[PDB]
């Protein structure tokens, strides 16, 4: 059948035909007009049946020969006499309205369908999500139009409680009264709740127009909105999204689906609202402007397992208004004052004439209702009585079940309605159980309900007592919220690749991931020995800083809004912002380095760059408050973050805006100085004091209190306890500024010598210069080996791959390797003694020297890149060479487009030679630089310097070269000028930041270096190997300075959040929009105080009476 | 305290609120004990108790002691002292 429906659902066909009233209408001949008229006790006439039991029977009479014995006339019950058959009407209707083709899903089932079957159709076939609420609207039909305000409120509130609680508004479907007002309400607040509210009208197949059109198995069946000018029949309504078209008989009989609606009001009740929540899906009843049989239906609800409550809408109509007044004028839960029956029954009488026979019979259906006032609710429209029905409806299911507030809260948690929990569940007098808000917190954290995690903390939930090991294990092992599916791909990549099917994640496995995403020497709290013991054994199972364990959780599970919540809570804000930037940055890299349908890396890198900006904006906040303590905030050991450092975490994530921030750049400036005050010293005197040692003792050093914000070495800090003479030398030579200038002078003296050796005759044996030069490069290479070993992450391959990423460190290896090839050939070669350069081993050795020296001039740009002005130009040069590449490839093609025709036209008689690869490229290249070769153009001229090249076709070449230079000089060189002019500012801005960023790695490399430059360094190397087989900088605070610093951190985070709102709130965009919203509210009130005074001036001539 | 919380962060490090409470009607009384500590404290009002919890936004506490629980009338005199000793200092 290719439809789950047809195998399962059916219709009803009235197989059996029975008489009507038995009166043939008029018109004496009775036998055939019996065929013309006789509405079966079905309700359709004999011929409208078309049934196969009744198709070849009208020939004789029909079913049931003769009178059939009046008793047996009273025997048609559809059960025996109407057949279940395959559906014939399920599809998608379409409404003809402005730009909305509004769709639905009609089914056409028999009323006998099992209630399980219905819910299945709704959920799997129609692919609907189980609701968090069901608002079953019951009212009267053809209720013309409600007053303008009362339609606005019941039109905003029903939509607001259905868009926020994902609810199914069960209805009647007929476009008259209830469904008519529900639909208009939808249309007045559509397109914000469009694909959120699912409105199922349960209509009969009786009172239904274009009934024959809806027929058609699996169709896009059409439908109209032109109300049939004559008909009492009813049309389905525009905005209802689904339809249950029950069938028992025919037209009329609008009472066979009432039982099926009740089934769906039950079967949803037995489903759990959420996988974690034990409460069933709620069901509420909304009465507005009802009927005579409403108050009957109301009675049924409040007498069931459990009592489906009722929210009545007074001020709209008759039954609501009746039911409004009666339960309002009731005893607390019971009878009335001195008999109120006179007014009540009179009140009941005017709505509906009953008249003491059954106007009393209402008083019984009207007593048990008001006796159940606790379950009944009423929205007093026009009295701000719970702020449209959304509060009232949702409230109705919390107050009227005498339920625990645990269940009342959790319902709000599944609804995501914090206001209803904070204004009706956390109200004064509420008394909670020992750990019930904890279970709410556990559900809010898993369900990613940040706004309840806020509330549960604000009330009393301590995350110190809350957060334990076995619980925080659960939080990783959930699928009941927003998840990072990569956390398993990461936990796989650390646990050797094997994940058993269960594999309940362990915190030790999370610690291994945090070590891998944070890189280097990071050691998490979970991988330590002290945790692997308490863990496998299982206050001690409670973590000391819980909100640092959940910040990581929220990040590893890719829960930014929870991460951007738990970050404000707790201490070490700037640290956690730089960790998170690092976790997301590594999570992002491993997402791009993997195969997956959703890349989830532009999401993670943005998440990383969101916390990276929080750290910078807190640094700018601390720096604007105190500069000295802000620099201390960059270098204190964290002690919950692997003894790391907020700066080290930023350098780990290449978070350049933080390292290029003026605070770090000023600390970096102060670590460069050392104990020397270069504000009352000059570079002349540092150089002078390197060459004149006793001039070290005439320059200004820095006190211990001008060196407290500066991370130091231990030995350096041990000489802040006392300045004596030998201490004053240890302060000079160990400053990074001095190690620099003490290396530059050796390096400049090195080039002066190596320039001399390369320009002067090189004899058999190396001269004293060339020995001094080899010694430098030899020991300089030992230093680079030592730099690589004593670097960072113990994996030999990592230290390698880092050091070979800098430009000049690649050049250093070529420069060092090439020099000792050249020395091997130079020194290892048999001198000829007739004349040098007859030995080609010797020549090759020298020519490597003459080329190796180019590496060593270009290395001066690394020394010159220490200046604030020069260095950004040096980095800039390379960023431009990379960006001008494709312009220069075009310039190389125009070159060959010219050199090959020229060489071919001017030298026709050439055999193949390697000189043909020079001559096609040589002169055309030197033309780019202004050499025109004027007397080689027009080789047939008299002034020509190539008179023998004159021959056939050579008159073409001056035309060719005229085009060539026009292209190269007038187009391509000036296009490249234009390139540089329009890319200058942005490469200069990048190069300033990359310069400021790499000033960390540079300055911090000159703390680790020995004191002696690369010729005499070997002493320092040897002394460091002696004390290796015989025996970086840190910020030392006393315990009171750590206190004063953690205060300063806290105080500056407060000023950050305070000043962020004070700016947002004090902005014209915010002041226009709240002004906008107040003038709305006022205007409403001004046309209501304006109404009241219009009800006062009428009361000047009435009181006059 | 609620008044402080409704107008905090503009007067945060400006208003100093000293509650002079007895060591009698005081919850988690045994927890506050501990010489020179960052001692913990809760805001989960003990479901059964007539006892009283210190309030969230008070920045200082004078926890007078004479006896035990109950007896909420031994600090009244000390508050009066601090209402006097400040009176004898010159405002500027
Ligand atoms: C970041 C840090 C990275 C570190 C990177 C470091 C990388 C270092 C890289 C090093 C690569 C070194 C390559 C050298 C090439 C030698 C070839 C040569 O000259 O052959 C000639 C000399 O042949 C001899 O045997 C000469 C022996 C005497 C001289 C000693 C050689 C010194 C080598 C230097 C040691 C360097 C110390 C390195 C210290 C570091 C052969 O020519 P011939 O004699 O004319 O003809 C022979 C044939 N016949 C027998 C038929 C006649
Ligand atoms: C240390 C030595 C420095 C010396 C300079 C050496 C050049 C320095 C190069 C810097 C950056 C530029 C990219 C790298 C270049 C290598 C190949 C390449 O990428 O090809 C590209 C295709 O290009 C072609 O297919 C045409 C190549 C023809 C070569 C002709 C050379 C002629 C002279 C000209 C040479 C004379 C020198 C010109 C200098 C201005 C593919 O590139 P892509 O996939 O689009 O990737 C671009 C970047 N991205 C990944 C971010 C998108
Ligand atoms: C990122 C940058 C990378 C580079 C990218 C670009 C590629 C660069 C590659 C270019 C091709 C070079 C091929 C050389 C051919 C062999 C030469 C030879 O054997 O001997 C010659 C070598 O001595 C010289 O004087 C010529 C060397 C060429 C210098 C280049 C100048 C033009 C710039 C080029 C730039 C523009 C390139 C435009 C695009 C193509 C000498 O003379 P001969 O006659 O050949 O032989 C001896 C005979 N004789 C004694 C009688 C004289
Ligand atoms: C603004 C000023 C211009 C005024 C306008 C009128 C134009 C005037 C042109 C007139 C054409 C006649 C000139 C040649 C004279 C006769 C033959 C002769 O002497 O040939 C000479 C070469 O020259 C040639 O062989 C032919 C040159 C033709 C190219 C002319 C340019 C076309 C217009 C513009 C093109 C631009 C693109 C067009 C699209 C915009 C032979 O002399 P040789 O070379 O020294 O070699 C002799 C020695 N050999 C025997 C050993 C080889
Ligand atoms: C730039 C300032 C900053 C600091 C720089 C770092 C400072 C350190 C820098 C470099 C290392 C030390 C340099 C001097 C070493 C050689 C001394 C010498 O004369 O050797 C040479 C001596 O022997 P000879 O000359 O072969 O003797 C021949 C004698 N005979 C002919 C009589 C047989
Ligand atoms: C590794 C770390 C190095 C650090 C430096 C420490 C080591 C440096 C120390 C000593 C090394 C020098 C040893 C000299 C031995 C004698 C040489 C000789 O015979 O005569 C030469 C003398 O010497 C010179 O003229 C100097 C040669 C080097 C030039 C650069 C010196 C400055 C660099 C380093 C110092 C500056 C500091 C830089 C800071 C800004 C040349 O003689 P002449 O008179 O020209 O010959 C006549 C020519 N005629 C034949 C055509 C007529
Ligand atoms: C494959 C070759 C061996 C491997 C070399 C691989 C490079 C290794 C690295 C370095 C090499 C070690 C230093 C130079 C060695 C000189 C040797 C020499 O012959 O000197 C001659 C003069 O020249 C000198 O005496 C030069 C002395 C200055 C050296 C500069 C460093 C001093 C700084 C201190 C700080 C630390 C310095 C050290 C840091 C490493 C004297 O020798 P000779 O015999 O009297 O005369 C020459 C020969 N003849 C007899 C034919 C005329
Ligand atoms: C790990 C890094 C790579 C290392 C590579 C390995 C390096 C070492 C390579 C090679 C070993 C040295 C060979 C020894 C010479 C044998 C021949 C001989 O005896 O002398 C002949 C030399 O004839 C020539 O052509 C010499 C050319 C030498 C230069 C080539 C190497 C360039 C290295 C590239 C740069 C790399 C820099 C580093 C880049 C990072 C002639 O001289 P003769 O014999 O005295 O007398 C005449 C006899 N005859 C006329 C009859 C012929
Ligand atoms: C025995 C020997 C006797 C003495 C020897 C004397 C040797 C003299 C040695 C050097 C000359 C330069 C002296 C000026 C220094 C100024 C101060 C300074 O530090 O400025 C900057 C230079 O920082 C550097 O690192 C400069 C490195 C220079 C070496 C490159 C040479 C270029 C050669 C290529 C040219 C070829 C032509 C070369 C000639 C053929 C750094 O300062 P900053 O980062 O801005 O910090 C201050 C910031 N503030 C202002 C905010 C506070
Ligand atoms: C004999 C002596 C001559 C003079 C000596 C001169 C010494 C040199 C002078 C100055 C050196 C400048 C310092 C560089 C600073 C670091 C830059 C760096 O790391 O790499 C930069 C790129 O790579 C380069 O820029 C490569 C180095 C460029 C040198 C230019 C050679 C061109 C010649 C060949 C043509 C000759 C034609 C003829 C052929 C025969 C950084 O680029 P980026 O943008 O950050 O990232 C790249 C990735 N991207 C592509 C996606 C963007
Ligand atoms: C620009 C728009 C179009 C206008 C073009 C105007 C056309 C130009 C007009 C006329 C055509 C060119 C010929 C005129 C000159 C002939 C004189 C002569 O003999 O010259 C030489 C030969 O030269 C030849 O034999 C060349 C023959 C044709 C070359 C191909 C067409 C060039 C036009 C390209 C157009 C590119 C268009 C590109 C399109 C963007 C010299 O010969 P010789 O040495 O005296 O002979 C004796 C030799 N012997 C002793 C060895 C035996
Ligand atoms: C896409 C681009 C198109 C242009 C181009 O790049 C690619 O195409 C390349 C092909 C090259 C030639 C290949 C073969 C040889 C033979 C050789 O014969 C040695 C003989 C003898 C010495 O005397 C041995 O002993 C001499 C050199 C020559 C002619 C090359 C010249 C350069 C050319 C034209 C290159 C040119 C730049
Ligand atoms: C084709 C070969 C055999 C001939 C020689 C090629 C020329 C172009 C080579 C010889 C040595 C080379 C230089 C060696 C060292 C450096 C330092 C480096 O930081 C940038 C490149 C630079 C500046 C090289 C540029 C190109 C260079 C000048
Ligand atoms: Ca020129």
From Swiss-Prot, chain A:
Activity modulation: Channel displays constitutive activity. Channel activity is negatively regulated by cytosolic Mg(2+), Mg-ATP and low intracellular pH. Resting free cytosolic Mg(2+) and Mg-ATP concentrations seem to be sufficient to block native TRPM7 channel activity. TRPM7 channel activity is highly dependent on membrane levels of phosphatidylinositol 4,5 bisphosphate (PIP2). PIP2 hydrolysis negatively regulates TRPM7 channel activity. TRPM7 kinase activity does not affect channel activity.
Swiss-Prot/TrEMBL cofactor(s): Zn(2+)
Recorded phenotype for the gene knockout or disruption: Inactivation of Trpm7 in mice results in early embryonic death (6.5-7.5 days). Mice die as a result of trophoblast defects and consequent failure of implantation. Tissue-specific null mutants shown defects in cardiac and renal morphogenesis, organismal Zn(2+), Mg(2+), and Ca(2+) homeostasis and thrombopoiesis.
Sorted UniProt keywords: Acetylation, ATP-binding, Calcium, Calcium channel, Calcium transport, Cell membrane, Coiled coil, Cytoplasmic vesicle, Ion channel, Ion transport, Kinase, Lipoprotein, Membrane, Metal-binding, Necrosis, Nucleotide-binding, Nucleus, Palmitate, Phosphoprotein, Serine/threonine-protein kinase, Transferase, Transmembrane, Transmembrane helix, Transport, Zinc
Membrane topology, record value: Multi-pass membrane protein
UniProt topological domain (Cytoplasmic) ranges: 1-734, 789-807, 865-883
UniProt keyword Transcription, yes or no: no
Record field: intramembrane: 910-950
GO biological process: actomyosin structure organization; calcium ion transport; calcium-dependent cell-matrix adhesion; intracellular magnesium ion homeostasis; magnesium ion transmembrane transport; necroptotic process; protein autophosphorylation; protein homotetramerization
Protein's job: Bifunctional protein that combines an ion channel with an intrinsic kinase domain, enabling it to modulate cellular functions either by conducting ions through the pore or by phosphorylating downstream proteins via its kinase domain. The channel is highly permeable to divalent cations, specifically calcium (Ca2+), magnesium (Mg2+) and zinc (Zn2+) and mediates their influx.
Protein name stated in the entry: Transient receptor potential cation channel subfamily M member 7
Species: Mus musculus (Mouse)
Encoding gene per record: Trpm7
Positions spanned in the full protein: 3 to 1230 of 1863
């Amino acid at each position: 059948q290719k439809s789950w429906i047809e195998s399962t659902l059916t219709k009803r066909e009235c197989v059996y035909i029975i008489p009507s009233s038995k009166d043939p209408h008029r018109c004496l001949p009775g036998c055939q007009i019996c065929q013309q008229l006789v509405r079966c006790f079905c309700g359709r006439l004999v011929k409208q049946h078309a049934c196969f039991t009744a198709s070849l029977a009208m020939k004789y009479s029909d079913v049931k020969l003769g009178e059939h014995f009046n008793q047996a006339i009273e025997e048609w019950s559809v059960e025996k006499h109407t057949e279940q058959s395959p559906t014939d009407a399920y599809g998608v209707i379409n409404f003809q309205g402005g730009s909305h083709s509004y769709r639905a899903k009609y089914v056409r089932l028999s009323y006998d369908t099992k209630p399980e079957i219905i819910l299945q159709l709704l959920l799997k076939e129609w692919q609907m999500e189980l609701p968090k609420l069901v608002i079953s609207v019951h009212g009267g039909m053809q209720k013309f139009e409600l007053h303008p305000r009362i339609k606005q409120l019941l039109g905003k509130g029903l939509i607001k409680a259905a868009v926020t609680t994902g609810a199914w508004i069960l209805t009647g479907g007929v476009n008259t009264g209830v469904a008519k007002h529900v639909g208009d309400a939808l249309k007045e607040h559509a397109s914000r709740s469009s694909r959120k509210i699912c409105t199922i009208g349960i209509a009969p197949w009786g009172v239904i127009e274009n009934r024959n059109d809806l027929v058609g198995r699996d169709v896009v069946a059409p439908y109209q909105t032109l109300l049939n000018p004559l008909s009492k029949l009813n049309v389905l309504n525009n905005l209802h999204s689904h339809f249950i078209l029950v069938d028992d008989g025919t037209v009329g009989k609008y009472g066979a689906e009432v039982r099926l609606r009740r089934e769906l009001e039950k079967t949803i009740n037995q489903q759990r609202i959420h996988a974690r929540i034990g409460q069933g899906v709620p069901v509420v009843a909304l009465i507005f402007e009802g009927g005579p049989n409403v108050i009957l239906t109301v009675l049924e609800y409040l007498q069931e397992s459990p009592p489906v409550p009722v929210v009545v809408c007074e001020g709209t109509g008759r039954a609501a208004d009746l039911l409004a007044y009666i339960h309002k004028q009731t005893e607390e839960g019971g009878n009335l004052p001195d008999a109120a029956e006179p007014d009540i029954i009179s009140t009941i009488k005017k709505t509906f004439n009953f008249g003491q026979s059954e106007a009393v019979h209402l008083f019984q259906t009207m007593m048990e209702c008001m006796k159940k006032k606790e379950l009944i609710t009423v929205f007093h429209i026009g009295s701000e009585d719970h702020q449209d029905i959304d509060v009232a409806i949702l409230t109705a299911l919390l107050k009227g079940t005498n339920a625990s507030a645990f269940d009342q809260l959790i319902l709000t948690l599944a609804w995501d309605r914090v206001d209803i929990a904070k204004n009706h569940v956390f109200v004064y007098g509420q008394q909670w159980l020992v750990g019930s808000l904890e279970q709410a917190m556990l559900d809010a954290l898993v369900m990613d309900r940040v706004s309840f995690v806020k509330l549960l903390i604000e009330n009393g939930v301590s995350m110190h007592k809350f957060l334990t090991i076995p619980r925080l294990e659960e939080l990783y092992n959930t699928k009941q919220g927003p998840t990072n599916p990569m956390l398993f791909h990461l936990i796989r990549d650390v646990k050797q690749g094997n994940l058993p099917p269960g594999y309940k994640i362990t915190l030790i496995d999370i610690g291994l991931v945090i070590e891998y995403l944070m890189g280097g020497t990071y050691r998490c709290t979970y991988t330590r020995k002290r945790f692997r013991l308490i863990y496998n054994s299982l206050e001690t199972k409670r973590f000391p800083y819980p909100l640092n364990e959940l910040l990581i959780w929220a990040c590893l599970m890719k829960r930014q809004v929870m991460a951007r919540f738990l970050w404000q809570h707790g201490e070490e804000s700037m640290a956690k912002a730089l960790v998170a930037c690092k976790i997301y940055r590594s999570m992002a890299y491993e997402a791009k380095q993997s195969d997956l349908v959703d890349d989830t890396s532009e999401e993670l890198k943005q998440y990383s760059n969101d916390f990276g900006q929080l750290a910078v904006e807190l640094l700018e906040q601390s720096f604007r408050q105190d500069e000295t303590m802000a620099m201390k905030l960059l270098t204190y050991e964290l002690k919950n973050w692997s003894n790391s450092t907020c700066l080290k975490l930023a350098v780990s994530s290449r978070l350049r805006p933080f390292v290029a921030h003026t605070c770090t750049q000023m600390l970096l400036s102060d670590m460069w100085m050392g104990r020397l005050n270069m504000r009352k010293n000059s570079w002349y005197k540092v150089i002078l004091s390197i060459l004149v040692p006793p001039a070290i003792l005439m320059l200004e050093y820095k006190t211990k209190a001008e060196m407290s914000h500066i991370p130091q070495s231990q030995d350096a800090h041990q000489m802040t306890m006392e300045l004596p003479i030998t201490r004053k030398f240890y302060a000079f030579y160990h400053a990074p500024i001095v190690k620099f200038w003490f290396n530059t002078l050796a390096y400049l003296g090195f080039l002066m010598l190596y320039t001399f050796v390369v320009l002067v005759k090189m004899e058999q044996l190396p001269s004293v210069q060339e020995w001094i030069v080899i010694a430098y490069i030899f020991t300089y290479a030992i230093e680079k080996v030592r730099e690589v070993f004593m670097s960072e992450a113990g994996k030999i391959s990592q230290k390698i791959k880092v050091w070979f990423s800098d430009y000049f460190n690649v050049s250093d290896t070529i420069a060092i390797i090439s020099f000792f090839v050249g020395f091997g050939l130079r020194f290892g070669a048999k001198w000829n003694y007739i004349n040098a350069y007859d030995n080609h081993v010797f020549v090759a050795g020298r020519l490597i020297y003459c080329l190796n020296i180019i590496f060593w001039y270009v290395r001066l740009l690394d020394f010159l890149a220490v200046n604030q002005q020069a260095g950004p130009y040096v980095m800039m040069i390379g960023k431009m060479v990379a960006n001008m590449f494709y312009i220069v490839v075009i310039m190389a093609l125009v070159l060959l487009s010219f050199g090959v025709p020229r060489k071919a036209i001017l030298y026709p008689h050439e055999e193949p030679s390697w000189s043909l690869a020079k001559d096609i490229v040589f002169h055309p290249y030197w033309m780019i630089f202004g050499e025109v070769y004027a007397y080689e153009i027009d080789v047939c001229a008299n002034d020509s310097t190539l008179p023998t090249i004159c021959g056939p076709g050579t008159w073409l070449t001056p035309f060719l070269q005229a085009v060539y230079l026009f292209v190269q000089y007038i187009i391509m060189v000036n296009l490249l000028i234009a390139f540089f002019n329009n890319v200058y500012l942005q490469v200069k801005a990048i190069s300033n930041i990359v310069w400021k960023y790499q000033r960390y790695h540079f300055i911090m490399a000159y703390h680790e270096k020995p004191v002696l430059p690369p010729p005499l360094i070997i002493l320092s190397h040897i002394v460091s190997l002696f004390c290796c087989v015989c025996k970086g900088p840190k910020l030392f605070l006393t315990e009171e300075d750590q206190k004063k610093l953690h205060d300063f951190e806290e105080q500056c985070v407060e000023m950050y959040f305070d000043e962020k709102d004070d700016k947002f709130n004090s902005g014209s965009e915010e002041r226009i929009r709240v002004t906008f919203e107040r003038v709305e509210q006022m205007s409403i009130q001004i046309k209501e105080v304006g109404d009241r005074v219009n009800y006062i001036k009428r009361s000047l001539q009435s009181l006059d009476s």
